[PDB]
Amino acid sequence: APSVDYPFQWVVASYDGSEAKNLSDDLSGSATLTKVMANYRHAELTSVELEVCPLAAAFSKPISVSAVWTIASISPASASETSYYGGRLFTVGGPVLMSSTTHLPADLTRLNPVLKGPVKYTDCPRFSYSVYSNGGTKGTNLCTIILRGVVRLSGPSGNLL
Amino acid sequence: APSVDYPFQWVVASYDGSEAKNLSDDLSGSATLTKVMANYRHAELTSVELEVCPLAAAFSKPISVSAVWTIASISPASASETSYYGGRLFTVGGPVLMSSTTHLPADLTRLNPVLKGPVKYTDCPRFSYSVYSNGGTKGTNLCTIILRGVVRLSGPSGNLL
Amino acid sequence: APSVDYPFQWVVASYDGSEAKNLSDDLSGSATLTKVMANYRHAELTSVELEVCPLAAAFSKPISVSAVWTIASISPASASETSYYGGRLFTVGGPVLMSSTTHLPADLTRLNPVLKGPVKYTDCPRFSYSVYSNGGTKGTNLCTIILRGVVRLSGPSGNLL
Amino acid sequence: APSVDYPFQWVVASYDGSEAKNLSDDLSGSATLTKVMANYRHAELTSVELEVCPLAAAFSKPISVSAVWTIASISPASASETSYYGGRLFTVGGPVLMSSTTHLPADLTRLNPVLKGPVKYTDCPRFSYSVYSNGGTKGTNLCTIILRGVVRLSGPSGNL
Amino acid sequence: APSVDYPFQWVVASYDGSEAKNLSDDLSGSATLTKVMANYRHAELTSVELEVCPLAAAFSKPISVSAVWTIASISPASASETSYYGGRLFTVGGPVLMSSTTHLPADLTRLNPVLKGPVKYTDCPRFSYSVYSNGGTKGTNLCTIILRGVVRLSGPSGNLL
Amino acid sequence: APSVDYPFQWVVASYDGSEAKNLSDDLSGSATLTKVMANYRHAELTSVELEVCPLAAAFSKPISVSAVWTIASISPASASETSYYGGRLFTVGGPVLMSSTTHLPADLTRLNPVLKGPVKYTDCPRFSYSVYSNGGTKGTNLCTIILRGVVRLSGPSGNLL
């Protein structure tokens, strides 16, 4: 079946260290990807990764974020991402807002790349992260969580234009 | 180059014989197709056509629409579609409320099917039509215009969504 | 056709964090490259990348710059570069003005390398970046945006010597 | 595709050495040639040249005209046609009042013959000339610049 | 080594018989060719020639120019080009305002075509000419000198622009 | 001809940010390499690079140095190294005096490796750097510029022992 590799990117959420914020999301049910896959019947993840970009305000005040790419069935709790395989702890800020170590790629060999199809899969990739309570300012938004990846979309459906 | 044959269909508008209404539109600049194919680098028509579907109110009051599929460079004036080659004059209504004779398909062998690509072609299809007033009630909506076709889309772009 | 690989480099612009500055530029229409390609009829990008070099004054005050290499048709808005695929957010400064992570290479597989030819292409690479409002000093110019790349130039024209 | 070879010829302009006059024109945008090819989708040159024909009044007063054929991207400045490759400095007048050496043909193998088509080209032929004043008395018209050639027109369009 | 045959043409100057004017120039040090080929590592002439084009004012007042294409080492003095082998003495004007006999081509088999390269050759072509005064009006510009030719340029350098 | 690969290293110069200092040097004419190549007739650069080692005093005060490896013919001016291809801007200091990004290797494919031979080449590598006016102390010497490389030396001459 003919298909196109569709690259996507969006800032998942901007965060400040005012309080701990936990977000766990399944890529099959994400609102901003379902609009991309609404026009196609089949979608398979070629690649995807979670990026934590530091912002300039984080230079003097780092933020620690614990992130993990788990299976759709498993939903890790808040501040428990490092207890699962592949769970990493990213400290953004300090004097070096340069390192690319803040990338967390999804191991699509251990996950089901199919985000859409004839059936709803229970093994789709699900990204869960938790931002810890830092000093906080309530307005700086000195951290950013971003998703980028590629989805192979096939079988366009007769949806709205 | 991998590509998908995207079938599109949408109602251009609904018209009644309250006043004469002219609408000319280049398919490369149509808002609906633009929002469909702004996420892809290349788009090429495989088929496209205009259709004038009669409604129930047209049963007792037929309405006449003059339509033409001209080149991108040529922009027909209002109520002058019959003065261009291929310009048909459909009349929808009466006891015959269903007929395939009101379909006007574009000659993609004569026109240029490419609506998007590396270069800006000047031969894209452009559909022009004029609906003549026959005594509508400003809300009766005697007829409706539907544009349906298929676009082969290749090379998805890293767009906003 | 005989051709020469022409390496080019110029500081695109020096910036201080006094206010947010957004620059989007198409390499086909850039003034400082058109002088290089004025003497040749065909120009094709072998490679090109956008570099954000920190300056010493940025050591105590970092700057965040959001940059993206998009298609010529797409013109991302200010502070929206991270919402497009390949859009990166570079934080220059801090205690480490060393990392080479500030390079943003153009994906010439997803872009048209031809910056000049018989026709004007609508899919040339276009670099769009936005410098955010930092503390600012109005005179330090504590960040630099630089373009370097290689253009294969062929078919010299009878222009001015 | 069916096509017809349209031979065109028109006097670009008559000049006298009253003052220096510069004219640069792209054949895609030439109004006379554009209205010639206004009813066809495609138009491609087969030959074109710029002729500088002396007049009788130029017998005692030659005119110097510097002319060049370039691509549409390159637009020569006034009185600078000899600084571009192929620019030639013609002189019309004197005892020799008729010569084929005053005709400058366009190298359509180097330029792009297509003046009209699906895509607007940036390397279409453009002719730029400059006429240098010698002291003409505002009415002599010692020389005439004439452009003639053949354009093949294909794919008529119903622009009625 | 990839290279391009760059055709160059420019007017050296315009002369009138107001006073005798001498100009000797080595092609490796000519300002116009230097600004052309300062962006390339290697440059080699394929052809080059001097030409004395008569103007309209020369019709009633011919002017004489003595020209020579000597070696880089030899620098002819003023009004002494006829004393060197190959030194021609052209006279432009009169009823014959057009003639190819006033072209002086360089003998690149005798001279050294290389104007730029790894080593500094001492055999580069050098053109010398002297225009004799015949009674010009300080603004009439009886004749003009044009240098035209082709340079094969290889190995572009990372220059300023 | 028999030859030996001779590795060389010397601190080119130690600098403090008291004032801007510009040094451009050709490796064929450098005093400290000519003593190595004085005993041999032919010398060809296998490799060479310019290293900017930060010193401990630079930890609290970084220095920005703009360096470039150009051709022998091209002599870049002060503070204009980033305008040439391969021109880099090195910021030494901060909290991370570790990164090896301060190395600037010479692209010997684009340069003539021969530093000595029967003829004097005009395309030898030439390194030009400029140290900008930092805060300055006049005695710390909180930056170091060092050259290391390898020269293949062949054909020993009857010089002094």
Author numbering:
A (entry chain A), B (entry chain C), C (entry chain A), E (entry chain C), F (entry chain A): 36 to 196
D (entry chain B): 36 to 195
The publication says:
CSDaV is a positive-sense, single-stranded RNA virus that belongs to the genus Marafivirus in the family Tymoviridae and has a monopartite genome of about 6.8 Kb. In brief, CSDaV encodes for three quasi-equivalent CPs that share amino acid (aa) sequences at the C-terminus but differ from each other at the N-terminus. The whole capsid models of the two types of particles are almost indistinguishable and reveals a T = 3 icosahedral symmetry that gives particles with a diameter of about 30 nm. Each subunit of the asymmetric unit has typical Jelly Roll folds which consist of eight antiparallel beta sheets.
